[PDB]
Homo-oligomer: A and B are copies of this chain.
Amino acid sequence: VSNLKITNVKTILTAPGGIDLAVVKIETNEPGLYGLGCATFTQRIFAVKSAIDEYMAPFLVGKDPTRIEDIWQSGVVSGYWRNGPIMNNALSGVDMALWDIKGKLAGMPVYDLLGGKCRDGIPLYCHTDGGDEVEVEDNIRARMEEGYQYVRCQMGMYGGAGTDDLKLIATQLARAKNIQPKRSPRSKTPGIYFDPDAYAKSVPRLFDHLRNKLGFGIEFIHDVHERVTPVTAINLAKTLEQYQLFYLEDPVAPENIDWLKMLRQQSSTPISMGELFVNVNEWKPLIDNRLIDYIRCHVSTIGGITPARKLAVYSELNGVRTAWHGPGDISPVGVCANMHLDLSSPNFGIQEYTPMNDALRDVFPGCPEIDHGYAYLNDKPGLGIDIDEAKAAKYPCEGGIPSWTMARTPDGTASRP
């Protein structure tokens, strides 16, 4: 296969799981040979589509798709300004599709191009929630019955607020029932109100209950989701040491990463950070200084497999493990990309997993097999995943803007959500 060229780049917007996704398909001049990539930044899908269709398409047409790194390095600087979530997702859609094409050319899964299997299956964690400790407990028992050996445990999702916004995970979750928030001022500006201090106090109570009822064999994760002041998060990490979490996630905002210096002087609770990261200057000081135990980047939002590989290696050499973002707002193509990285990384930590519905499996043939808390990738070439464009059209994106991201503390302050 010589004189290989990119012929077309297109964006497919689809929501079979009830959450807006963006997927890139790159066609070549070799009949039947194409690649797929994930560009899912769900809150800005139309702007990602614009970045792909108006900019990436004329940048790529006619170029040899074999040169993944050169295309990545030149694409990243093509607009001069860079290091942002919309830009990165456009590059990710392209980059993953190129890895997909290379694996097809090689007759090899991407995990094989990257050095082959380092494990026999991919251990997963899934989410459990509830309005009180008993409901959280009940949900964890149901997941344990299914074979999950790791679970994230929240009571009232993030900051105890729950969610009524279907744009987040396509399902409503109850506010924490028994958290007594502070009284607000006499008129309130609209928002999703939460009480960071009432939330913080509830977390150790939740884990005390769960450990009493469920024991210490089951692995537990909790996500702070940047909801409290940094000293509150530090105190939280210290009080949770006794409950031996697999990790405590996002104790600080990316804008407050310096505070992890203080956190790591005091606490030995394992820490994860980074689903929000878009810049090397966010993650590099954390990893260089061993201020986290797991890196959490959303692969498409850091620009695809090419940069994720590099992050996985940088973390490896510093004893930091991977925990790629696995929410509902990631396409099955991105779930595959996370998993090809997972299977080939010596320093894989865990794979967050949001279970799919039948519509997702139908629109995307080749979804990883989930069997008793482990994921098993098929051994098909490239990413081992495909998209049925006609079936995708049955689930048009809803578009619009989320409501959950307007988070206000009791006095009405707009807060990092």
Contacts and interface: CB of A to CB of B under 8 A. Distances in A.
A279 B255 CA distance: 8
Contacts of A55: 43-44, 46-47, 401
A417 interface: yes
A280 B301 contact: no
Interface in A42-92: 43-44, 46-47, 49-51, 54-55, 58-59, 70, 73-74, 77-88
A49 B47 CA distance: 8
B46 A50 contact: yes
Interface string A361-390: 000000000000000000000000000000
Given A54-B46, A279-B281, A189 B81 contact: no
Contacts of A400: 58
A33 interface: no
Given A78-B405, A417-B77, A54 B47 contact: yes
B81 A406 contact: no
Contact of A77 (B79, B189, B405): B405
Contacts of A319: none
A414 B84 contact: no
Contacts of A414: 70, 73-74, 77
Interface string A157-193: 0000000000000000000000000000000010100
A415 B76 CA distance: 10
Contact of A254 (B70, B83, B87, B407): B83
Interface in A273-314: 276, 278-282, 285, 298, 301
A78 B406 contact: yes
Contact of A255 (B41, B254, B280, B416): B280
Contact of A84 (B46, B54, B86, B417): B86
A257 interface: yes
A46 B51 CA distance: 8
A192 to B, nearest CB: 11
A107 interface: no
A220 to B, nearest CB: 24
Nearest to A282: B281
A278 B74 CA distance: 19
A82 B88 CA distance: 12
Contacts of A416: 77
Interface in A248-286: 254-255, 257, 276, 278-282, 285
Contact of A417 (B46, B80, B280): B80
B84 A276 contact: no
A399 interface: yes
A402 interface: yes
Contacts of A82: 85, 276
Interface of A: 41, 43-44, 46-47, 49-51, 54-55, 58-59, 70, 73-74, 77-88, 189, 191, 254-255, 257, 276, 278-282, 285, 298, 301, 399-402, 405-407, 414-417
16 contacts: A41-B81, A43-B55, A44-B81, A47-B50, A47-B55, A54-B399, A58-B401, A70-B414, A74-B406, A74-B414, A78-B405, A79-B402, A81-B276, A81-B298, A257-B281, A281-B285
